[PDB]
């Protein structure tokens, strides 16, 4: 019903947060953030599409991939 999230805000391992589970969305993740607009999101996903990757997610409506039993992600800023 709720899953764990742990991301990297360029560099931080901010504390694993609980996030409600209706398939956690990218917009559902970035509504936890302020002063965005120029953030860039990746999420560790099990895929060696021809071993694992950090696939960029840009749509507020995409399902976020699930690694292990969480959503290990990585958000970094542009310039």
């Amino acid at each position: 019903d709720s899953i764990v999230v742990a991301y990297y805000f360029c560099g931080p391992i901010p504390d694993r947060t609980l996030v409600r589970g209706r398939a956690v969305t990218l917009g559902q993740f970035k509504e936890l953030l302020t002063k965005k607009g120029s953030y860039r999101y990746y999420f560790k996903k099990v895929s060696d599409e021809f071993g694992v990757v950090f696939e960029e997610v840009r749509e507020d409506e995409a399902v976020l991939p699930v690694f292990e039993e969480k959503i290990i992600g990585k958000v970094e800023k542009v310039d």
Binding site: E49, V53, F54, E56
Partner: protein, 66 residues
Amino acid sequence: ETKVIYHLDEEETPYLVKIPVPAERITLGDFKSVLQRPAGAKYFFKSDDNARLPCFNGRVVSWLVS
């Protein structure tokens, strides 16, 4: 749209980014227009902006060094 897997510096897990240019026209200029990485990184590939990127079955594999 071309799938590009690049190893940034030497991080464990690489990155996957889709570039909205079909693999017939996939250029280093497109890779830069997607990444928008501070200068000046170098690029290698698995095999200039006008030059194309080598891709088999629509997959580009690259390495970046800060």
